[PDB]
Amino acid sequence: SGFRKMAFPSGKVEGCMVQVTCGTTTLNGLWLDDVVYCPRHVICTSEDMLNPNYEDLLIRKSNHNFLVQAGNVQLRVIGHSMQNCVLKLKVDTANPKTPKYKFVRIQPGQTFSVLACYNGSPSGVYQCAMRPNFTIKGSFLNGSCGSVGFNIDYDCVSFCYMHHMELPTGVHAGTDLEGNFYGPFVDRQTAQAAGTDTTITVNVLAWLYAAVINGDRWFLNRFTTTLNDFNLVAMKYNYEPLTQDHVDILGPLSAQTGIAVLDMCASLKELLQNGMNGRTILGSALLEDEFTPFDVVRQCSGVT
Amino acid sequence: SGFRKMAFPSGKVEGCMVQVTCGTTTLNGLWLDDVVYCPRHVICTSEDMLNPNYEDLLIRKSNHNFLVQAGNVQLRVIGHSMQNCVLKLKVDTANPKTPKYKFVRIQPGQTFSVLACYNGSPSGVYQCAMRPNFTIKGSFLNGSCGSVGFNIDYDCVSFCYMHHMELPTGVHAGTDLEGNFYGPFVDRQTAQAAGTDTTITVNVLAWLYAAVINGDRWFLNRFTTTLNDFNLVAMKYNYEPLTQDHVDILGPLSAQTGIAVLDMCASLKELLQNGMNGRTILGSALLEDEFTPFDVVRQCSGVT
Numbered sequence: 001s002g003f004r005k006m007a008f009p010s011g012k013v014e015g016c017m018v019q020v021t022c023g024t025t026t027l028n029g030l031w032l033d034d035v036v037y038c039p040r041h042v043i044c045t046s047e048d049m050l051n052p053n054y055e056d057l058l059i060r061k062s063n064h065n066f067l068v069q070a071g072n073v074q075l076r077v078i079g080h081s082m083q084n085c086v087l088k089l090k091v092d093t094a095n096p097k098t099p100k101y102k103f104v105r106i107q108p109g110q111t112f113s114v115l116a117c118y119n120g121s122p123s124g125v126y127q128c129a130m131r132p133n134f135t136i137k138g139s140f141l142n143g144s145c146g147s148v149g150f151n152i153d154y155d156c157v158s159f160c161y162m163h164h165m166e167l168p169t170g171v172h173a174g175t176d177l178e179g180n181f182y183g184p185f186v187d188r189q190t191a192q193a194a195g196t197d198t199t200i201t202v203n204v205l206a207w208l209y210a211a212v213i214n215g216d217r218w219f220l221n222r223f224t225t226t227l228n229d230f231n232l233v234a235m236k237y238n239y240e241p242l243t244q245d246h247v248d249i250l251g252p253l254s255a256q257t258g259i260a261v262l263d264m265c266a267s268l269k270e271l272l273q274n275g276m277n278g279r280t281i282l283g284s285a286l287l288e289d290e291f292t293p294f295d296v297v298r299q300c301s302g303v304t
Numbered sequence: 305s306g307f308r309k310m311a312f313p314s315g316k317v318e319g320c321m322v323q324v325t326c327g328t329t330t331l332n333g334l335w336l337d338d339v340v341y342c343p344r345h346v347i348c349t350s351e352d353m354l355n356p357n358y359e360d361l362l363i364r365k366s367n368h369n370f371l372v373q374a375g376n377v378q379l380r381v382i383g384h385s386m387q388n389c390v391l392k393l394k395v396d397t398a399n400p401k402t403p404k405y406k407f408v409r410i411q412p413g414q415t416f417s418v419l420a421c422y423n424g425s426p427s428g429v430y431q432c433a434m435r436p437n438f439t440i441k442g443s444f445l446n447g448s449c450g451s452v453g454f455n456i457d458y459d460c461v462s463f464c465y466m467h468h469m470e471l472p473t474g475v476h477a478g479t480d481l482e483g484n485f486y487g488p489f490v491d492r493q494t495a496q497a498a499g500t501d502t503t504i505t506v507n508v509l510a511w512l513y514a515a516v517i518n519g520d521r522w523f524l525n526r527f528t529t530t531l532n533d534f535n536l537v538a539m540k541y542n543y544e545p546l547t548q549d550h551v552d553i554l555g556p557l558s559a560q561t562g563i564a565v566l567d568m569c570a571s572l573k574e575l576l577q578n579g580m581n582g583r584t585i586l587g588s589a590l591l592e593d594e595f596t597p598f599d600v601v602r603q604c605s606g607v608t
């Protein structure tokens with residue numbers, strides 16, 4: 001037993017990390033097959049970021065201006081193209097370490113692991129969630145751009161995120177692997193405020209089930225509620241509305257523990273109204289929302 | 305910016321994980337060079353665990369009884385020996401994926417990453433600390449035994465932990481890679497209670513520095529304290545005593561932020577006496593103690 005914020009093993013992604021330099025800007029690239037994916041702002045100087053015209057900036061760049069280095073060996077760039085906010089650098093060598101992969105665009109509330117990289121080198125791995133306001137709360141310093149988010153199903157890596165920027169409030173914005181930003185964010189050094197960061201209700205309930213499975217049960221009460229009654233409370237506390245789809249997804253957890261979803265909603269309702277009263281749940285003093293129902297099942301069953 | 309509970313990239317360790325079976329027991333092994341390291345309780349049946357005589361149990365085992373599988377290929381066992389609570393299975397093939405490595409015995413308060421594995425397959429990676437009572441709070445289900453803890457310095461993996469057991473209270477005990485248990489724990493299904501789980505004071509202060517560096521400053525106050533005055537408060541709240549060595553280790557963090565160590569101790573003192581008052585620090589509602597001063601410097605500087 002025991003329940004931890006766990007990231008996927010990062011090895012399959014570590015073998016894809018490369019360094020991309022264009023002029024004086026160095027960031028990370030993702031090498032899959034004979035293509036290197038990286039944020040298009042690799043072609044910008046810090047001055048360009050205020051109001052870049054990426055199409056015009058890219059005209060002044062040729063294949064030889066993109067320096068791609070994998071470890072200490074140089075990749076030969078034979079083509080380049082811009083797809084939305086990412087550059088695709090065609091190289092003459094297929095990455096021999098390319099794992100089975102897919103590009104997926106995740107929904108808010110879904111979790112993924114991030115392999116933070118600097119100069120093409122991995123520094124660490126952590127788990128986060130795509131917030132309902134389409135930001136992520138990561139750990140990204142200068143040079144981390146191009147670091148990627150992913151999930152793994154047995155041998156298939158599903159890439160879902162590429163890091164592009166830090167908003168003035170310290171939260172992070174980025175794209176899927178087709179270069180489309182999550183949310184309304186743009187790759188420009190401009191006023192971009194995030195919307196309300198609401199709590200992922202279905203994730204909190206999943207984590208409450210994980211807590212019961214691992215022995216933390218003090219929060220279980222003698223009450224029940226309805227979806228509409230629960231949602232009145234959820235609205236008041238800036239929690240996402242719970243739908244029947246969310247209830248359905250919690251079904252396997254409800255079955256394992258014998259606690260009906262609406263009874264767990266009544267425990268969550270009381271926790272929202274009364275607080276933790278100085279107590280903890282799974283080593284946390286707040287309600288954790290970055291474990292999906294699938295993460296809880298996966299961790300609680302031992303899927304490798 | 306941003307500050308996350310980050311694990312080391314696990315790729316170098318993933319290439320060392322193997323499955324070891326002896327009779328009807330299957331757990332994880334660590335393949336480095338031509339040796340496979342695994343918990344000696346692989347030779348036990350669940351009945352044996354009540355009172356095992358490992359030397360007597362090992363007499364009934366030959367090289368051919370240890371089945372070592374790396375992926376889907378079988379390793380040939382040409383020798384076996386017991387070192388403390390670990391078995392060393394000499395195989396005829398050096399692991400071609402062996403990284404640069406060391407075996408280190410860590411001190412309480414030190415952190416490390418764990419690559420949770422089942423049947424020789426990695427399932428996830430997370431960061432934890434060796435508690436002052438020599439337990440770890442991990443996430444280990446049946447089959448996770450033999451999963452390892454490690455730190456990475458550029459290309460060198462320092463293995464520090466091998467998982468062996470779960471105490472009746474849900475906390476975890478294990479050995480270094482020489483097979484010596486951390487703490488007084490034994491590889492026997494017996495009454496083994498853990499001592500006081502005190503808070504790692506030097507780690508909490510390091511994390512308070514990380515919070516200031518990343519913008520969370522509400523807890524900074526107009527006060528200072530002394531080591532003896534602080535330690536009176538630390539004793540009352542089951543925090544480890546802070547020594548001048550701990551102050552010295554926080555020096556680079558004190559210098560970066562301009563906040564003297566004893567002033568940060570006075571902030572911690574007030575936080576202990578008054579609580580968070582419904583507020584959070586780096587997304588936590590409790591004082592986090594599983595980031596060492598070295599982890600804070602490493603994450604805040606971008607070491608790969």
Ligand SMILES: *CC(=O)Nc1nc2c(S(=O)(=O)NCCc3ccccc3)cccc2s1
Nearest residue numbers: 027046140141142143144145146163164165
């Ligand atoms: C994702 C990534 O690599 N971002 C980068 N940002 C910069 C910048 S910046 O946008 O001006 N932000 C600098 C923030 C900072 C860091 C350390 C001390 C003070 C301020 C400038 C240069 C390079 C990169 S890479």
Ligand SMILES: *CC(=O)Nc1nc2c(S(=O)(=O)NCCc3ccccc3)cccc2s1
Nearest residue numbers: 331350444445446447448449450467468469
């Ligand atoms: C570290 C590791 O692999 N531990 C294992 N423990 C067992 C046991 S046990 O010690 O009896 N614990 C079983 C706990 C449990 C799990 C699921 C449902 C109920 C109880 C038995 C068999 C195998 C392993 S591997």
